[PDB]
Amino acid sequence: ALHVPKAPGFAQMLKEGAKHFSGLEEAVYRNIQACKELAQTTRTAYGPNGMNKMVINHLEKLFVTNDAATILRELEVQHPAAKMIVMASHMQEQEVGDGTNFVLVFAGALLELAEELLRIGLSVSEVIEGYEIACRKAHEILPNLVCCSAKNLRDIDEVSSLLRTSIMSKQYGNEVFLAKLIAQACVSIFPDSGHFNVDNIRVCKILGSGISSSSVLHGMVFKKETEGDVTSVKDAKIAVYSCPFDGMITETKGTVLIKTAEELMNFSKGEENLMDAQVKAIADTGANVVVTGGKVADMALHYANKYNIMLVRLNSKWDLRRLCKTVGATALPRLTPPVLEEMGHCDSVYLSEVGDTQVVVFKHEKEDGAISTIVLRGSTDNLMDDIERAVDDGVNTFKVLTRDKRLVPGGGATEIELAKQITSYGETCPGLEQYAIKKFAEAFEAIPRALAENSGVKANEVISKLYAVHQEGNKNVGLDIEAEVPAVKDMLEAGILDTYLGKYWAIKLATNAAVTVLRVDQIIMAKPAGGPK
């Protein structure tokens, strides 16, 4: 009478390390608690007043940032429900580029309120149906909340003003300068064709001079040196070769069969003459810069130096393709001289040193080109990485604006308006789904609440003021960051705007993740065993 045996049936047949959780308390409440914990971990990094977190992964690498997706990626999340929410956040990052923290916070609030509803008496099916109805209502409402449109994407000032809000959450203090940089870089790209490519914006991180010294270059920068003696060309005529800069050899097996003394004495001289002829044929087309994707032979280098030809050796084929795009050359597969169509052109190619790193610069004087690069300076590697993350967020925002030009007021104004309208709609709806609809509406309060908490004010006063102001009829009013007391101000005139498409996708994904978590009723976890990767 001192031991409780395992119940007969499945409990006894379970494996040695496996776990089985079933029912509300064992499974659903535990999943909700785990998701709430994850949301709490990421909550403090939300908004302009969000705080960076220094995360060290299993490889002893240091990450400091407030980008929610990066933080979740570097955290070794183990609880499977939190894993599902992290997958939702990563999907939001991949689809849009911003709103990962919104997805996480909204999902956490939804799951918390779902636990509340389950405790007061509702069933899982009713809560799920209520959330689905409320999500449909929110997606219907949102297009009516659009305040203005981009209406121009070739203007530097307009694009910078549009992109300021996206890169104000990260790098709050100095966002105008970064906005101008990213606006110039994006306007260089995005030709008359409506298609915009994110990969056409390259980022080069050169350490030392503070991030205020960063600039935008219409071309590319490679952190390497020239093979030859020539180190500067002012009327570049780049000829790109994907093959090694050496005499091509057979593919099965090549052996030099010598049968007489004369052949032995003439072989090396003939090979050298052939290489010289090939290099001179290349040079006679006017080409003065040669870019090769492979190694450079010594004889080829010597003959290129004789004919005053600049040699650059690109290790990665991705860089070779990007250079071909940005110059206008075709990567030849042999050592044949390039025809006039395949010959690339650039305004200036030269070797230069920035800080203590030698770089090769392919610079265009024109305000155009397929590929543009941003040279990031700074006093720390981590700082430059964070600035690069902010640049990526801004570029993704520009891409979204190209896809959809509609914008909604930021600073929690859209969330408060959505909450108010969904609460109004849910009151008219009878049945047991009204509780779920009202909780879905209330879950939108977590965004202004997080903003107010991070700004250091009382969230409740801010939310009450927002409801009041939206009650008179101002739907473009959000909280004011630059105030020590809870206060609100108009966001349309302040320019604090976030993309409509981002909000739409974030709401959809967060709702889907919360519903998917709620649908689970049993968990059968296998023995963790190993799995290093």
Binding site: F10, Q78, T252, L257, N512, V520, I524
Partner: protein, 527 residues
């Protein structure tokens, strides 16, 4: 203790009633776990692997495979369910439930001193009668689109969310009707199932063509060709080494260059054959070639093809040869010795889609494709896996319905009627096998019980309501999962595959009979 333990000391043995107790306990445990899967109102289970992969599922076979169980009887039942899934593609949870209830009902009499042999004899007599009744009750009907839609709904609603099921029904029925040749067996290999991971779950749809998970490897090839000729080939266009160890011998750099230029003549001949065919077929820029190759293409040949405005794909799947020849309508070529415009397929639109680091090529707007693809879209990997399993079940269900014109009313109506018929037939069975017949009928009654239980209603009261309605009316009334009242499953549209029911009866009876007759379990292969 026993003989085996005497001969082999490190042996585990269960004898006489111990074997029956062990087997019945294992069956009861499996049944207790799988009770909650049955029906569209069943609960969704979450499975985490050792590596941490998350799988949301409701399928009985999928759940059984991902169980953390090492029991022998569980292994036997899992094998039976695996066979059921392999052949009919549905009814795994019903299989497990019926086996467990058969064993429980048999034990209910065996514990009263009755021998298992009599129970098995009653089981086989009841199975014969039940098969006769199922033959009587099936609804032979030519199946237009509506009946197939009803069957696909009856499966997919049980597998996934209602709205996702509504989309998947149209998808699966249209695909099956597209690939179905007249009075010919349906080849399910001709429906490619491709997963993309960017849109929502309801964005999955049917493409009247083909989708390939790879794209052109040359940046200069066209990303979208409006009018396209299709060349499906199984010829390697990359460099090939001689089988008999050739090696090259030269005495000068010029000779080496000559040998290098002349070592690609063999491949260049085939490339120029393709180029000549393309120039003969289309002399303008309106049309174009898409060359899908099962074998690789080296960069030289890719460049040579791109210079002529030809998009080429390499390393295609083996099944894609048949799929393209059935969709585009060309001829798969293993050599270019005699290639003519008549062997070229056609496609009304070919374009490439980029998703992250993966390329997808769409071959659609075919004339009358006999092979289509089901593009599965979702935000999560586990969502994609769940949709793929549901689509497999729906495809199997629709194909099963097409195979035989009959279809069986669902919602447990058939089991209720079968149990009543067995009870009526019981006096005709001579001897104590009437006990086995009664046990078989009560075991068949498990499906409405579990359906009513999962729907939240009372079990016994709902079942007696259904049985009373069926007895007084004679109709095939099932369980209405919304109200618990009797409902005519035929009129509403809750249909079940006749082959699935027949397989359930046969396999469940066979395995239960074999298990009941087991009187010893031995593990003495060690040492």
């Amino acid at each position: 203790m026993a003989a085996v333990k005497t001969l082999n000391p490190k042996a585990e043995v269960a004898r006489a009633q111990a074997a029956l107790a062990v087997n019945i306990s294992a069956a009861r445990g499996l049944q207790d776990v799988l009770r909650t899967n049955l029906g569209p109102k069943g609960t969704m289970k979450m499975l985490v692997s050792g590596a941490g992969d998350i799988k949301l599922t409701k399928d009985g076979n999928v759940l059984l495979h991902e169980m953390q169980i090492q029991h022998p009887t569980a292994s036997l039942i899992a094998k039976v369910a695996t066979a059921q899934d392999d052949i009919t593609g549905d009814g795994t949870t019903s299989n497990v439930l019926i086996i467990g209830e058969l064993l429980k009902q048999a034990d209910l009499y065996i514990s009263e001193g009755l021998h298992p042999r009599i129970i098995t004899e009653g089981f086989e007599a009841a199975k014969e009668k039940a098969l006769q009744f199922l033959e009587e009750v099936k609804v032979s009907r030519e199946m237009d689109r509506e009946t197939l839609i009803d069957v696909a709904r009856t499966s997919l609603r049980t597998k996934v969310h209602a709205e996702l099921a509504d989309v998947l029904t149209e998808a699966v029925v249209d695909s099956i009707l597209a690939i179905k040749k007249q009075d010919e067996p349906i080849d399910l290999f001709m429906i490619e199932i491709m997963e993309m991971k960017h849109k929502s779950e309801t964005d999955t749809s049917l493409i009247r063509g083909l989708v390939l998970d790879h794209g052109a490897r040359h940046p200069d090839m066209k990303k979208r060709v409006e009018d396209a000729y299709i060349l499906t080939c199984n010829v390697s266009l990359e460099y090939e080494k001689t089988e008999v160890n050739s090696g090259f011998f030269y005495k000068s750099a010029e000779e080496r260059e000559k040998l290098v230029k002349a070592e690609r003549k063999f491949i260049e001949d085939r490339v120029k054959k393709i180029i000549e065919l393309k120039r003969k077929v289309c002399g303008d820029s309106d049309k174009g070639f898409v060359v899908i190759n099962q074998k690789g293409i080296d960069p030289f040949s890719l460049d040579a093809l791109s210079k002529e405005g030809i998009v080429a794909l390499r390393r295609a799947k083996r099944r894609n040869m048949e799929r393209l020849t059935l969709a585009c309508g060309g001829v798969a070529l293993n050599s270019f010795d005699d290639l003519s415009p008549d062997c070229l397929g056609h496609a009304g639109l070919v374009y490439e889609y980029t998703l992250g680091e993966e390329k997808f090529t769409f071959i659609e707007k075919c004339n009358n494709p006999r092979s289509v693809t089901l593009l599965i879209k979702g935000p999560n990997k586990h969502t994609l896996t769940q949709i793929k399993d549901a689509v497999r079940d729906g495809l199997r269900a629709v194909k099963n319905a097409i195979d035989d014109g009959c279809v069986v009313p669902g919602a447990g109506a058939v089991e209720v009627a079968m149990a009543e018929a067995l009870i009526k037939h019981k006096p005709s069975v001579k001897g104590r096998a009437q006990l086995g017949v009664q046990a078989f009928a009560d075991a068949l009654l498990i499906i409405p019980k579990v359906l009513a239980q999962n729907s939240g209603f009372d079990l016994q009261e709902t079942l007696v309501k259904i049985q009373a309605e069926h007895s007084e009316s004679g109709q095939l009334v099932g369980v209405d999962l919304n109200t618990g009242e009797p409902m005519v499953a035929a009129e509403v549209g809750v249909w079940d595959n006749y082959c699935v029911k027949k397989q359930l009866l046969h396999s469940c009876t066979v395995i239960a009979t074999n298990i009941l007759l087991v009187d010893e379990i031995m593990r003495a292969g060690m040492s």
